[PDB]
Amino acid sequence: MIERRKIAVIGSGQIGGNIAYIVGKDNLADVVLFDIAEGIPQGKALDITHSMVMFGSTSKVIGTNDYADISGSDVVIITASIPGRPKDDRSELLFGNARILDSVAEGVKKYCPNAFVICITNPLDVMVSHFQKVSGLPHNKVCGMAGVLDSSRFRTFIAQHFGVNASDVSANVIGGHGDGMVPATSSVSVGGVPLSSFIKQGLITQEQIDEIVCHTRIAWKEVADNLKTGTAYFAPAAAAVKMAEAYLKDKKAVVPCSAFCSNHYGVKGIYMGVPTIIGKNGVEDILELDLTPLEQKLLGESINEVNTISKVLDNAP
């Protein structure tokens, strides 16, 4: 008995609304846009419902403040967060967003415990870890969106240098979504050609690569300082939809994201950004990148950042 796919978006602010809009435009699923703020999800859903006939989609998009409406959701995307952009570090939202997730975790557990959950709420790696702990869902059914956005940014910057289509740049960012993220230049390729080759050829300099690595690392502040009123939300929404697609269409897509890693990268059971294979059973596998010693070390420092914020959360007021 064919049933329409259903995605619940918890939090209907900037990112949440664009997720709804893109999912409906692609006719990927019906969408349930959930928020505790009166009127916001309802009006965004009505406005998006009107664009449906324009896109040729028959997806249904409704607004709600009732967890009961997310029952049967195949995928839950969590964007809910306290207000205001982080001033210097995504960690500043730690205390407030962990409380919100406790609440979202109760709604999920009761209305759609078999859903694939994708967290977006910052500080990402720690929020995903917190969510999985308080909700009790299987590790492979809970992951965080970050890698796809960090890697799209790294691929884009590399592509803008060489003047080529970014889809032809292969490049991963691993580790937690924060200042210590590791854009792995060691395995970047452009049409099959490694960066070491472009250096010999004289078409890119190590300094140029270094600037790309840095740009990647603090790209969030560049966008946030220009928007003034908030942080990025167009690409983070497209990234969440790519992850939801991988699950709903059982793609076996290789997706860098925050996933529970306990056997690769020399860690034994932590959520962090790694290349995963996503399909109908959620995170189905993690791939082992070939890191240089210097990279294995920068990863090591990333992991410590994650552990530190995490201990801080464990000792919250």
Place this chain on the structure above:
Amino acid sequence: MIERRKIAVIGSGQIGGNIAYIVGKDNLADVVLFDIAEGIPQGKALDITHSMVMFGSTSKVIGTNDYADISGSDVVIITASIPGRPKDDRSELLFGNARILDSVAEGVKKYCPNAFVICITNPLDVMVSHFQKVSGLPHNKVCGMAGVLDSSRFRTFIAQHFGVNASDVSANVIGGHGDGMVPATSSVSVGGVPLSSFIKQGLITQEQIDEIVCHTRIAWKEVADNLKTGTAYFAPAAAAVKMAEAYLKDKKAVVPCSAFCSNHYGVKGIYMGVPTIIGKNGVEDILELDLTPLEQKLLGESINEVNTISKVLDNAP
């Protein structure tokens, strides 16, 4: 010589950003987001650029505040407007927006006078007329977006009543984008079946049709009262992309928009909501709907309100 298609969005608020996002996602053209507000267009353009590789698009999107950047634009879409949502009417903002439009007209006149210009700035029909006058562009290359958004709502509401895909509802809303808009119920068909027939089959009462007509004219308020921030912006951005598409792909598509009508509907040269044929030469034709005496009267009232407010603006100091 193949050149990339180029679309300038004048005004990067709620609607402009969404238009950039969609156009980019569909790889329909490169996008220039123009705003005089500091940082907004650069920030949205940068965030959207990061999402191009996720959508598999090579569209380039940049933000600027220099009209010289819109030169060579094949289409210009105008969303520039002074702050604050309409209270009861999209009219109140008349002078400020006409002032704003004067700048854009000089901008377009200098940098890309061969562009197809689509206005969205309210009060729509007057704004469009004003833009064409002061810019001097061919009448058939200047029009306003309203009908697509109104007809989409009208189709959506008819489709919800019958429980069928809105894409299979054929329906037009003509006249001014105001309370004086005319949802032409006599032009309604659902898979070939007319409302009279559904009437006789007892599948819809006249009361229900009336309520649908009313829902259409006041639908914008319903969205605005829920957003508590401004007016609808997801569906109006999509409607403008559909208009840009008919132009760029030379579709010869039926697009209900605000065009220079001068030998149909009993008017001799005014800008109003009518069913046009858009292709690579802009508005290439206007179709003549089979209106009932009542609708002819209703359109009548609508037509006066345009000229009325149009004179209020022809004077001023």
